[PDB]
Design a protein around this ligand. Structure first.
Ligand SMILES: CCCCCCCCCCCCCCCCCC(=O)OC[C@H](COP(=O)([O-])OCC(O)COP(=O)([O-])OC[C@@H](COC(=O)CCCCCCCCCCCCCCCCC)OC(=O)CCCCCCCCCCCCCCCCC)OC(=O)CCCCCCCCCCCCCCCCC
Ligand code: BCL
Ligand code: BCL
Ligand code: BCL
Ligand SMILES: CC[C@H]1c2cc3[nH]c4c(c3C)C(=O)[C@H](C(=O)OC)c4c3nc(cc4[nH]c(cc(n2)[C@@H]1C)c(C(C)=O)c4C)[C@@H](C)[C@@H]3CCC(=O)OC/C=C(\C)CCC[C@H](C)CCC[C@H](C)CCCC(C)C
Ligand SMILES: CC[C@H]1c2cc3[nH]c4c(c3C)C(=O)[C@H](C(=O)OC)c4c3nc(cc4[nH]c(cc(n2)[C@@H]1C)c(C(C)=O)c4C)[C@@H](C)[C@@H]3CCC(=O)OC/C=C(\C)CCC[C@H](C)CCC[C@H](C)CCCC(C)C
Ligand SMILES: COC1=C(OC)C(=O)C(C/C=C(\C)CC/C=C(\C)CC/C=C(\C)CC/C=C(\C)CC/C=C(\C)CC/C=C(\C)CC/C=C(\C)CC/C=C(\C)CC/C=C(\C)CCC=C(C)C)=C(C)C1=O
Ligand SMILES: COC1=C(OC)C(=O)C(C/C=C(\C)CC/C=C(\C)CC/C=C(\C)CC/C=C(\C)CC/C=C(\C)CC/C=C(\C)CC/C=C(\C)CC/C=C(\C)CC/C=C(\C)CCC=C(C)C)=C(C)C1=O
Ligand SMILES: CCCCCCCCCCCC[N+](C)(C)[O-]
Ligand SMILES: CCCCCCCCCCCC[N+](C)(C)[O-]
Ligand SMILES: CCCCCCCCCCCC[N+](C)(C)[O-]
Ligand SMILES: CCCCCCCCCCCC[N+](C)(C)[O-]
Ligand SMILES: CCCCCCCCCCCC[N+](C)(C)[O-]
Ligand SMILES: [Fe+3]
Lengths: 302, 241, 281
């Protein structure tokens, strides 16, 4: 058969690449890691270096504090016994404070206090990681597309854990930290709001999640099919169109009647994905603040 | 009526503007549409051409503005087979040599692709300090076999992408002492040989040559890759089992 | 009309059936033998859906629904009005999808490219056939299949799930979801990355792939590279659909009780099954 280009047939290696400099502060880059032959069959073999300034240290420190806050609670539910800890791991749960306490920070540690500590730490870990995706792009003179797309994911998380609970008047409306318990919450949320299949934003969110899989299957398969004319070299195909880009366009024109460019397929891509969390966050925000029952709402509003 | 209906109706209007923006951005190459004779077609569709943008290319290589004037900048050896629109156009000579159909190339610039530091992106491994085969079967030294099961030559180097650390071509020596490049995506490395399905042994000499022995240009890569992919259709007579 | 660069590619050949008989275009669309076949199967399918709508008594697209034969018919033929139309439309739909894939293969041959696109598409077709053919046959009735209607098919998803409790607890369904969410993450990153290099800060030169690798190593200590990310997206996307089909082929056949109860295998391992405390003791 033809070679398919899913795995490489031969690996080739040279001196470790320290990367482009531009305006990056080099005093804050690590050394290079080891090479992985295993990873090299599918992509690059080089591990490292990594950049680590003030904002990365902060993100890591609070990220680990969030993890260890959850971890000691699980251990305490297991009665400190490591057999029980592994047996019931998927069943342990750190729960928010009860409705009684509303939005106050006055609840005891064993009954909501720890949930608030863990959420504090997660909040700083995520927002500082966001700042770092902005700054690492700026140091290299690049556009801010990665930071804007990450903001769409942050929107859904923010709505679930912070904004919707504030607007309802209590922390008890937020999501618990637990593997099985957060699935039960998701199921329960739909029941209580009259079946989320009637939320039009939920339907749209699903259209974009299915469509993201459709589109990356299309795009990935297309670039491998024209890799025999150097198609994965997308930036130079933008600057100076080659037969790879012409054949990719004509496959789709002949199949379904229209086509993209090499730059333009990447605009279709970023938008298809970002609209998943954008529409989803809106659908959750409106649930219980403005609409109590989606079935009922659907009967009155086409 | 209520705030949720205000939101869903606003969202549908947003989405229509977004599709409009996305379709026009995807019209920066290839338009305006043409008739079979190269004149402008009458019906271009409901979307207009976008206003031009300009890319600044690195390393003093200038600018690109699109959309802009489109032309093939090369002869096309084809003729009509019917008296109306929509039928195939037949090659008038040899389609492998003329560069049409699945053997087609484009007139890209006749300079090599450069890296982040302004050096040639692809080099023969002999001129690429510290580079070596780290895993898999090393092809250098192996005979090369065509789809007619006959030996066309032997491998004498690998051409590597330095920034991305990847094998991109095999350099093959022919019966007369000259060499050609073969794309890595169109060969099969085995224990005792390299196999090439797309070409028969007699078609190897017609692979386009490069003008300098230590670099390849974008125009040269297109001619080479176009020609080897073309043998899947046009060599098929000699391919076998 | 043609794209400015298109005429050199419109040559004869590459067809699998018919020689030169159907080797032509209508506007932008390539036809071929399989273009004719998909039109025939699609048109016959649409007529039968229309006929189904007259017997139901609506033309409203939000209410039209074509139902499979009721369970008492098992795996035989049913009358048209009570399941037969669903059986024939399913044959047409399958014929249209397979024909659309084979037409894609002819297009690949004419253009001299790899076969990766129709190969990927065949995974979707498989997922469809699992729901309407493979699962129903293994269970013994067409009635376990889903109905064709905008809202009625969501009803089927909801009732089928809640037959086994909270469906979240199916372990193959958990893996399938991970792949769907991971695939959307990767698609956002790929599009953002290429666009951030083609469109830098105002007044600066276009970036290079070297800038793209550097960006990701500075950020997470690893970059998979430009060939690697296209391999990855293809793989995440197909794996999501593979585990979706698998999570349904086992439901109602090897496992038919509540999915939450399956996890008792883990908690009853004799090492810890009787130790007191935790959640399950
Ligand atoms: C209720 C329902 C309503 C839903 C509304 C949803 C909101 C949509 C947000 C729109 C963002 C537009 C951003 C923008 O200016 O684009 C510049 C962008 C330039 O991109 P480029 O050419 O790559 O420029 C790169 C340069 O280097 C420049 O480089 P750069 O590094 O500056 O990056 C450029 C660009 C690159 O970014 C992108 O292209 C993708 C951005 C993803 C954004 C996701 C945001 C998530 C927000 C979450 C919050 C939700 C709140 C909802 C309430 O990012 C930005 O423009 C900044 C965005 C910051 C927004 C933050 C808002 C805070 C509040 O061009 C566009 O993408 C235009 C988009 C056009 C959209 C269609 C318009 C529809 C209008 C409908 C009315 C017409 C009716 C007719 C019928
Ligand atoms: C996959 C698991 C379940 C299922 C679960 C769900 C859930 C849950 C939801 C949907 C939703 C949708 N489903 Mg369903 N769906 C299933 C099987 C299918 C099949 C099929 C033949 O196999 C089809 C054609 C559809 C079609 C659809 C769309 C009506 C809608 C948006 C999908 C989308 O954008 O996808 C991605 C594809 C694209 C973006 C490309 C565009 C595709 C267009 C929009 C399809 C239109 C189909 C047309 C109306 C029917 C044919 C008409 C003529 C006879 C030809 N589903 C199976 C049984 N589906 C959502 C909805 O809003 O429902 C009301 C929703 O919430
Ligand atoms: C029985 C349950 C209900 C239901 C209840 C809900 C609820 C409730 C919600 C959804 C939501 C969604 N549902 Mg629903 N859903 C149902 C049926 C379905 C069906 C189906 C075939 O039947 C499908 C396909 C879907 C599909 C979807 C998605 C389109 C959407 C989630 C988007 C996403 O990417 O989130 C994943 C992305 C995120 C969560 C963002 C994460 C961002 C942060 C910043 C990441 C931090 C990482 C951290 C620091 C690192 C830690 C590492 C870890 C340890 C690994 N649902 C049924 C009817 N569904 C969500 C939504 O948008 O609804 C509108 C939602 O809230
Ligand atoms: C209350 C319901 C239960 C539940 C019950 C079920 C059931 C039941 C099913 C799923 C299935 C799935 N669920 Mg679940 N699920 C729930 C909650 C969720 C949540 C969530 C956030 O809570 C998520 C993310 C998911 C996610 C998913 C996906 C893994 C999977 C659907 C994709 C798929 O199969 O595509 C596969 C893609 C297809 C079938 C599309 C095929 C397209 C065909 C080939 C071509 C169409 C052409 C068309 C006609 C063209 C028209 C052309 C126009 C003219 C242009 N579920 C809740 C707990 N879930 C489904 C599954 O795995 O199915 C196999 C399934 O049956
Ligand atoms: C458009 C919507 C989709 C999306 C987009 C998206 N996500 C993103 C981005 C974007 C565009 C980023 O840029 C950002 C990113 O950086 O990706 C690489 C991110 C991100 N999406 C993430 C996850 C994620 N995204 C999700 C969803 C989605 N993201 C959507 C589907 C999901 C889910 C639930 O579906 C998850 C789980 C993160 C990988 C990353 C953001 C990272 C972050 O905020 O981190 C906070 C920091 C920590 C938690 C630190 C602790 C982590 C480890 C414990 C550290 C390990 C080191 C330790 C010292 C071990 C030492 C061992 C040695 C001895 C060897
Ligand atoms: C395997 C990964 C994913 C994938 C990939 C994928 N899909 C693809 C391809 C690929 C690679 C194509 O090449 C092909 C294409 O051309 O895309 C533009 C296609 C395609 N994927 C499509 C849709 C689609 N894909 C989906 C899913 C996925 N596709 C996966 C997530 C989904 C869903 C539900 O998630 C849908 C809706 C089409 C746009 C297109 C195939 C077009 C086609 O087959 O055309 C021929 C058929 C007709 C023109 C009409 C037939 C009419 C029938 C006879 C009657 C209708 C009966 C039907 C069953 C009724 C359904 C009612 C519903 C309300 C339930
Ligand atoms: C790197 O490069 C790349 C390109 O280009 C350089 C590309 O273009 C594409 C293609 C991608 C796009 C253009 C982006 C937009 C695409 C989507 C969002 C995917 C969803 C697509 C649709 C919903 C459109 C579906 C349309 C279909 C299936 C066609 C409908 C067909 C008809 C009405 C006619 C039927 C034709 C037949 C029957 C054939 C015979 C015809 C007769 C008349 C007989 C990709 C992936 C790519 O990676
Ligand atoms: C111009 O191009 C580009 C490049 O080049 C220059 C690039 O470098 C990059 C950069 C890319 C990278 C740095 C790599 C990106 C990597 C990811 C996005 C993550 C991908 C994920 C994996 C490699 C892991 C594989 C898949 C996973 C983890 C999903 C499957 C999950 C599971 C199987 C586990 C689920 C968990 C549980 C608990 C289930 C429990 C079930 C049972 C017990 C049973 C980009 C974006 C790019 O665009
Ligand atoms: C997402 C994949 C995770 C990869 C993490 C690899 C980080 C490499 C860090 C460089 C190693 C530093 N060292 C060992 C030289 O000191
Ligand atoms: C306030 C809710 C914020 C969203 C958190 C959702 C729960 C995350 C589920 C994982 C729980 C933590 N852990 C240790 C199992 O990974
Ligand atoms: C950027 C690509 C745009 C793709 C458009 C997809 C349209 C999906 C239509 C689904 C209908 C959803 N509904 C009725 C519940 O609101
Ligand atoms: C809701 C999905 C409907 C998608 C329809 C897209 C098909 C576009 C084909 C148009 C090209 C044909 N023509 C004659 C206009 O050139
Ligand atoms: C959700 C995506 C489907 C809508 C996309 C509509 C695009 C139609 C564009 C027609 C292309 C113009 N043409 C054929 C004249 O070049
Ligand atoms: Fe790409």
């Amino acid at each position: 058969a033809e070679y398919q280009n899913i795995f490489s047939q031969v690996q080739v290696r040279g001196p470790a690449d320290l990367g482009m400099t531009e305006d990056v502060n080099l005093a804050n880059r690590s050394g290079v890691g080891p090479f992985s032959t295993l990873l090299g069959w599918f992509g690059n073999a080089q591990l490292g270096p990594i950049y680590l300034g003030s904002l990365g240290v902060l993100s890591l420190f609070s990220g680990l504090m969030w993890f260890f806050t959850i971890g000691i609670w699980f251990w305490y539910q297991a009665g400190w016994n490591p057999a029980v800890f592994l047996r019931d791991l998927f069943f342990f749960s750190l729960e928010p404070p009860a409705p009684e306490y509303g939005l106050s920070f006055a609840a005891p540690l064993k009954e909501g206090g720890l949930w608030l500590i863990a959420s504090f730490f997660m909040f700083v870990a995520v927002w500082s990681w966001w700042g770092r995706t902005y700054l690492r792009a700026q140091a290299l003179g690049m556009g801010k597309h990665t930071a804007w797309a990450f903001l769409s994911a942050i929107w859904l998380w923010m709505v679930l854990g912070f904004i919707r609970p504030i607007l309802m008047g209590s922390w008890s409306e937020a999501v618990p930290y637990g593997i099985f318990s957060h699935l039960d919450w998701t199921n329960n949320f739909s029941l209580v709001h009259g079946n989320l299949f009637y939320n039009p934003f939920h339907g749209l969110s699903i259209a974009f999640l299915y469509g993201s899989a459709l589109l990356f299957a299309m795009h990935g398969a297309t670039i491998l099919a024209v890799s025999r004319f150097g198609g994965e070299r997308e930036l130079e195909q933008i600057a100076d169109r080659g037969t790879a880009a012409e054949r990719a366009a004509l496959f789709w024109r002949w199949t379904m009647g229209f086509n993209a460019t090499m730059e333009g397929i990447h605009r279709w891509a970023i938008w298809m994905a970002v609209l998943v969390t954008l529409t989803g966050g809106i659908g959750i925000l409106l649930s219980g603040t403005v609409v109590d029952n989606w079935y009922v709402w659907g009967q009155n509003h086409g | 009526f209520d705030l949720a209906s205000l939101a869903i109706y606003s969202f549908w209007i947003f989405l229509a503007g977004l599709i409009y923006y996305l379709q026009t951005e995807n019209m920066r190459e290839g338009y305006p549409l043409e008739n079979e004779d190269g004149t402008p077609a009458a019906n271009q569709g409901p979307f207009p051409l976008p206003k031009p943008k300009t890319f600044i290319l690195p390393h003093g290589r200038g600018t690109l503005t699109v959309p802009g004037p489109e032309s093939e900048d090369r002869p096309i050896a084809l003729a009509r087979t019917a008296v109306s629109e929509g039928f195939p156009h037949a090659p008038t000579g040899d389609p492998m040599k003329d560069g049409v159909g699945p053997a087609s190339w484009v007139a890209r610039r006749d300079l090599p692709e450069l890296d982040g530091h302004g050096h040639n992106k692809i080099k023969p491994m002999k001129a690429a300090a510290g580079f070596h085969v780290s895993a898999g079967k090393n092809p250098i030294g192996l005979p090369v076999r065509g789809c007619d099961l006959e030996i066309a030559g032997k491998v004498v180097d690998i051409w590597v992408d330095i920034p991305e650390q990847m094998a991109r071509f095999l350099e093959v020596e022919l019966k007369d002492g000259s060499t050609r490049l073969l794309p890595m995506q169109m060969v099969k490395v085995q224990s005792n040989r390299v196999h090439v399905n797309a070409l028969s042994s007699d078609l190897f000499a017609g692979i386009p040559t490069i003008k300098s022995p230590t670099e390849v240009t974008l125009l040269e890569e297109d001619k080479i890759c176009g020609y080897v992919a073309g043998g899947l259709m046009y060599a098929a007579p000699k391919r076998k089992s | 009309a043609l794209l400015s660069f298109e005429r050199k590619y419109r040559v004869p050949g590459g067809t699998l059936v018919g020689g030169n008989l159907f080797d032509f275009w209508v506007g932008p669309f390539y036809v071929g033998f399989f273009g004719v076949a998909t039109f025939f199967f699609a048109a016959l399918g649409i007529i039968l859906i229309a006929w189904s709508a007259v017997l139901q008594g609506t033309w409203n697209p939000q209410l039209i629904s074509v139902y499979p034969p009721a369970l008492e018919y098992g795996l035989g033929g049913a009358p048209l009005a009570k399941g037969g139309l669903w059986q024939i439309i399913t044959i047409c739909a399958t014929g249209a999808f397979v024909s659309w894939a084979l037409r894609e293969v002819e297009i690949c041959r004419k253009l001299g490219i790899g076969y990766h696109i129709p190969f990927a598409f065949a995974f979707a077709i498989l997922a469809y056939l699992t729901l309407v053919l493979f699962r129903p046959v293994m269970m013994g009735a067409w009635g376990y299949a889903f109905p064709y209607g905008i809202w009625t098919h969501l009803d089927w998803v909801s009732n089928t799930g809640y037959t086994y409790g909270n469906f979240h607890y199916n372990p193959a369904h958990m893996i399938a979801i991970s792949f769907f969410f991971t695939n959307a993450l990767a698609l956002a990153l790929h599009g953002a990355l290429v666009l951030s290099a083609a469109n830098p800060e105002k007044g600066k030169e276009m970036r290079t792939p070297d800038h793209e690798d550097t960006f990701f190593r500075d950020l997470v200590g690893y970059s998979i590279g430009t060939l690697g990310i296209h391999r990855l997206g293809l793989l995440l996307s197909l794996s999501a659909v593979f585990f979706s089909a698998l999570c349904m082929i086992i439901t109602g056949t090897i496992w038919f009780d509540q999915w939450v109860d399956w996890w008792q295998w883990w908690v009853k391992l004799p090492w810890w099954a009787n130790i007191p405390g935790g959640i399950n003791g």
